[PDB]
Amino acid sequence: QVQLQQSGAELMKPGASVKLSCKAAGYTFTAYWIEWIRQRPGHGLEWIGEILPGSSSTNCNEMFKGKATFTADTSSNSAYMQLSSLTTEDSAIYYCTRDFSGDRSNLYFDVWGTGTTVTVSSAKTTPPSVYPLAPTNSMVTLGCLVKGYFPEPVTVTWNSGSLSSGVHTFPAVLQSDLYTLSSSVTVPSSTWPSETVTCNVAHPASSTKVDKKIVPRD
The contact set with another protein (CB under 8 A) reads 35, 39, 44-47, 50, 59-62, 93, 95, 97, 99, 102-106, 108-112, 114-115, 129, 131-136, 139, 141, 143, 145, 147, 166, 168, 170-173, 175, 180-182, 184, 186, 217
Q: In terms of CB distance, is 27 or 112 closer to another protein?
A: 112
Output the furthest CA–CA distance in the chain (Å, rounded).
74
Tell me whether residue 110 or residue 195 sits nearer to another protein (CB atom): 110
Smaller CB separation from another protein, 16 or 215: 215
Supply angle C-alpha 111, 114, 115, rounded to 5: 120
CA distance 184 to 187: 10
Q: 124 or 170, CB closer to another protein?
A: 170
A 10 A CB-CB count for 76 gives 11
How far apart are CB 106 and another protein at their closest, in Å?
6
> What is the three-class DSSP state of 77?
coil
CB of 19 vs another protein, minimal distance in Å: 21
- CB of 15: closest distance to another protein in angstroms? 27
Which has the closest alpha carbon to 98: 89, 85, 107, 106? Answer: 107
Shorter beta-carbon distance to another protein: residue 73 or 126: 126
CB of 104 to another protein, least distance (A): 5
User: Can you tell me the distance from the alpha carbon of 210 to that of 199, in angstroms, rounded to the nearest whole number?
Assistant: 8
Query: What letter would DSSP give residue 217?
Result: -
